Amino acid sequence: QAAITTTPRNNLNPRSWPAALVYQESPAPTTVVLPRDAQAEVQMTNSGAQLA
Amino acid sequence: HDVTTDRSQRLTLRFIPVDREDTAYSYKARFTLAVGDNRVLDMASTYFDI
Amino acid sequence: SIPYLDGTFYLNHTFKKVAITFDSSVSWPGNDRLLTPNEFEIKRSVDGEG
């Protein structure tokens, strides 16, 4: 299991250690929209019609 | 039978201000009241009792 | 001493309330941001210390 679980010993204890078998945490984002628009707000508030 | 309900539901509701106000000139009646999604809260018949 | 020729004013504390109303009706601080958007209070007239 020593050869199966990990690659055989080279540097027996390395502090300066890169990731290959040791896993880098999950890379998946979830993106959602906005209730209000970026460009559809400039027409109203400063002119007269207040937005709430 | 088309416009009827044979289900358990309330008729009269009462809520209190969670954030009670005790200032010199104002009382903020601060309700965290959520409307029932299969209910119809009548804003026509919504009033305060002092 | 002229209070403007050296930048040496004295009466910079003695205010009360200011209402900046744009075009005679709609208030400039009327973006809900402050407690009094209609008339933003400079120096309070002892309303409630809290």
From Swiss-Prot, chain A:
Bilayer-crossing regions: none
Residue positions, PTM Phosphothreonine? T7
Q: Where in the cell is it found?
A: Virion
What role does it play? Structural component of the virion that acts as a cement protein on the capsid interior and which glue the peripentonal hexons and group-of-nine hexons together.
Q: What is the protein name given in its UniProt record?
A: Hexon-linking protein-N
Which source organism?
Human adenovirus C serotype 5
Gene behind this protein: L4
Curated annotation (Swiss-Prot), chain B:
Q: Which domain of life does the protein's organism represent?
A: Viruses
| Induction statement | Expressed in the late phase of the viral replicative cycle.
Subcellular location, record wording: Virion; Host nucleus
* Function of the molecule: Major capsid protein that self-associates to form 240 hexon trimers, each in the shape of a hexagon, building most of the pseudo T=25 capsid. Assembled into trimeric units with the help of the chaperone shutoff protein. Transported by pre-protein VI to the nucleus where it associates with other structural proteins to form an empty capsid. Might be involved, through its interaction with host dyneins, in the intracellular microtubule-dependent transport of incoming viral capsid to the nucleus.
Additional comments on file? All late proteins expressed from the major late promoter are produced by alternative splicing and alternative polyadenylation of the same gene giving rise to non-overlapping ORFs. A leader sequence is present in the N-terminus of all these mRNAs and is recognized by the viral shutoff protein to provide expression although conventional translation via ribosome scanning from the cap has been shut off in the host cell.
**Subunit structure as annotated in this protein's UniProt entry:** Homotrimer. Interacts with the capsid vertex protein; this interaction binds the peripentonal hexons to the neighboring penton base. Interacts with the hexon-linking protein; this interaction tethers the hexons surrounding the penton to those situated in the central plate of the facet. Interacts with the hexon-interlacing protein; this interaction lashes the hexons together. Interacts with host dyneins DYNC1LI1 and DYNC1I2; this interaction might be involved in intracellular microtubule-dependent transport of incoming viral capsid.
Q: Give the similarity note.
A: Belongs to the adenoviridae hexon protein family.
> What protein name is recorded for this chain?
Hexon protein
- To which species is this protein native? Human adenovirus C serotype 5
What gene is this protein translated from? Answer: L3
Region of the whole protein represented: 54 to 103 of 952
